[PDB]
Each structure stands twice: as C-alpha cells, then as structure tokens.
Structure 1
Amino acid sequence: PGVLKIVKVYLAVKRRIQPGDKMAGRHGNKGVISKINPVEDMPYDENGQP
C-alpha cells in the first residue's frame, strides 16, 4: 500500500583481482594480495616460464 510504481535495475560489474583481495587454497592457507608484480620481475625456470 502507498506505492504506485517500482523500477528495478540490474547492474553487472566485472571485478578484477587487485591488491587487498583475499585469495586462498584448500588447506587453510589464506592471504591478501600485496602486489601485482610485472612479469619480467618474477622468478622463472630454465625454459623461461615465470
């Protein structure tokens, strides 16, 4: 009672992963992302795969 019209809007947001987001495995090893490192700065193997 008392309402004449209702308008409902659905908004879709694509949320990317950023520092501060909480990431975890399946063994209780939770964590918070501290840095999004550049590719060239991360450890890599002999074949070159970082």
Structure 2
Amino acid sequence: VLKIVKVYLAVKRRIQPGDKMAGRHGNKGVISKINPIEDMPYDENGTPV
C-alpha cells in the first residue's frame, strides 16, 4: 500500500421517536413521539414538563 487517506465525517444525530433513551436505574425506554410543547402538561406556574 502506498498511501492511506482517512476521512472523518460528522453527523449531528438528533433525538427522535424510537431512540433508546434510558435512565441510570435500569429505567429504559423508546422515544414514543415528539409532541408539540403545548401538548405537554404544565404546572400551576405554567412550566411544561
């Protein structure tokens, strides 16, 4: 072999419905779907969850 050219490609992978996202305790899950922020619940102060 004469030369070796290595190319690095960067992909900005965003979370989306389906990715395996899990907590520390063994809590697991699959992202169900990205519902709009307004559809998410909110507390008395109005902060969405």
Measured against the shorter chain, the TM-score band is: 0.7 to 0.9
Q: Which runs of 5+ in 2 are unaligned?
A: none
Shift of 1:5: 2.1
Please list every run of at least 4 consecutive aligned residues from structure 1 whose deviation after the TM superposition is greater than 3 angstroms. Answer: none
Structure 1 residue 37, shift from structure 2 partner = 1.0
CA RMSD of aligned residues (A): 0.9
Deviation readout 1:4-49 (Å, 9 max, x if unpaired): 2221101111111011101111111100001111001010001110
Tell me, in whole angstroms, the C-alpha distance in 2 between the residues paired with 1:6 and 1:29.
44
Indicate the SS of the match to 1:23: coil
Q: How many residues align?
A: 48
Percentage of pairs with the same residue = 96
Distance across 1 between alignment mates of 2:7 and 2:46: 48
TM-score by length of 2: 0.86
2: distance between equivalents of 1:4 and 1:27?
Answer: 51
Higher strand share: 1
The structure having more radius of gyration, on CA atoms, is 1
